[PDB]
Every structure is written in structure tokens, then in C-alpha cells.
């Protein structure tokens, strides 16, 4: 799961 | 007693506006500065001076730390730019993450060309100019980080793109169905085709003297993918073998399992 492997990038995209 | 619709502005113009809104540096701004007063970093002493009065270990490690900070700022700019690309934020969160993961460094080295000439590059929000030779003079493995980006930029800058062209090029880089691990590959391919169609048309209007400019830019996208593969290899060597060269967590995420 890309989103969980990329938590800071994930946060930037919310 | 009727309902008239919005407009809208052309997609090329809306992407150009999203690019001007979201990036601190652009080619107009950098060329203003590079023509003429940025403080020149060309040796160890000028580096210590620029550092003292501009950014508040071993010299190579501080230049690499400054390299990362720049990348993090730009990654954040690219993420906001991405969200202004129609269709992007309607993608699965996982697919947005994946498109940015593979695309940010291709976009970063593409836009880096705007702040580079044959002698050096603007740094520190336009307030410093670090010379290409100084960068070449650092000890291994740090002496070869930047030179391949200069080589790409000299040829990219020879295309004479403006910010309206680069914004679409960057958009096509981000909205890319090629990336590994996409699930909704069909939707993203349609988004990419739409972006690339507007890029193709824009280059015809904006660069009618250069009828191969579109195939030239397709090649540059493949050159960028290779440049980033080699960069990430070089970055892995540095992390592995330089204990001071700690990596910012956002960047580790991006490189982690990339190529
Ligand atoms: C004041 C000190 C000057 C600092 C000079 C650093 C300028 C770096 C600009 C672009 C660096 C490219 C990013 C490579 C690092 C990475 O994110 O993997």
C-alpha cells in the first residue's frame, strides 16, 4: 500500500 | 431565465497558473537574477561565508544537507502543483502517492535547469550562486552529484522553453501511467493523454519554429527517468557510506524501493 509506505508524502496529499 | 456555463480557461493556461502559484522559483525570476546580486560560492571560504550569513560538519556534508532541504521544499511545491492538475486529486490516494514518488525528481531536475547556466546554479531562494567547478572539486562521492544535472540542463535550456512550456512538461511528468504499481492505470493513462495532447498543441503554438520540439521533449522525459535512476543509486552510496549524510525522512520514503 503506497499510502502507508509513504506517510509524509501521504500527509502532504491529504 | 437560463443557465450559462463557467468558461473555462484553457487547460494550458490553468496549468501555467498553477505553476506560477506554487513554485517559488521560475525561469523568468531566475533569469532576472542571473543577468543582473547573488553571493557567489566558489571555494571553501565563500561557502563558509554564505553559510554564516544565509543558513545560520564536513563541507561536502553541509552542501548535501542543503541539497536535501531544497528537494524537500520542492517536493512540497510539486505536491501542491499536482493537486491543481484536473483529475489528479480524484485519483486514489495510493496512486497520487505513486505518481509523485516516481515523478518528483524528474520534475526537480527538469526545473533545476531554469536556475543553472554553464558556470553554476542559483541556490538559497535566489540568494546564492554556487559555481559548477566548485561542485566538481568536492571529494568523492560528492563531486559527481551535480555535474550530470548540469549536462542535462545545458541541453534542456538550449530548447528555449518558457514557464508556460515547462509547467505542461512537468504536468506530463507527474501524470504518468508508466509508473510501477499504479492500480487505476486506465484513468491515469487518459489523464496523461489529455495533458500530453495540450502540451503538443501548446508547443506548436508557442514554438512554431521548432517542429520537432514535441519529440525532443519526449526524449528528455526518458533522459530524466534515467538521470533519476542514476541519482538514486548515487544517493544510496552516499547514505550507505557517509555517516554524516543522514537523509530527510520524506526523501527516504521517496527513494525507498524506487529503482
Ligand atoms: C549556502 C550553501 C549552498 C547549498 C548548495 C546546495 C544547492 C543544491 C540545489 C539542488 C540540489 C539537488 C538535490 C540533490 C539531493 C537529493 O534530494 O537527493
Residue numbers in the entry:
A (entry chain B): 682 to 695
B (entry chain A): 196 to 231, 237 to 256, 266 to 468
Paper quotes:
Peroxisome proliferator-activated receptors (PPARs), composed of the α/δ/γ subtypes, are ligand-activated nuclear receptors/transcription factors that sense endogenous fatty acids or therapeutic drugs to regulate lipid/glucose metabolism and oxidative stress. PPAR forms a multiprotein complex with a retinoid X receptor and corepressor complex in an unliganded/inactive state, and ligand binding induces the replacement of the corepressor complex with the coactivator complex to initiate the transcription of various genes, including the metabolic and antioxidant ones. The same applied to the interaction of PPARγ-LBD and the SRC1 coactivator or the NCoR2 corepressor. These structural findings support the idea that the agonist-induced formation of the AF-2 helix 12 induces the dissociation of the corepressors and the association of the coactivators.
We have succeeded in obtaining 14 PPARα/γ-LBDs–SRC1 coactivator peptide cocrystals and aimed to obtain more with the other coactivators: CBP, TRAP220, and PGC1α. By employing crushed powders of PPARα-LBD-iFA cocrystals as crystal cores, we obtained PPARα-LBD–iFA–CBP and PPARα-LBD–iFA–PGC1α cocrystals and revealed their structures (respectively). In PPARα-LBD, the α-helical LXXLL motifs in the four coactivators were located near the AF-2 helix 12 that was formed upon ligand binding, whereas the IXXXL portion of the consensus LXXXIXXXL motif in the NCoR2 coactivator was located in a position that interfered with helix 12 if present. In summary, the coactivator preference of PPARα-LBD was presumed to be CBP >> PGC1α = SRC1 > TRAP220. PPAR coactivators demonstrate varying intrinsic biological activities, including some enzymes, such as histone acetylases (e.g., CBP) and ATPases, responsible for chromatin remodeling, and proteins functioning in between the NRs and the transcription initiation machinery, such as TRAP220, PGC1α, and SRC1.
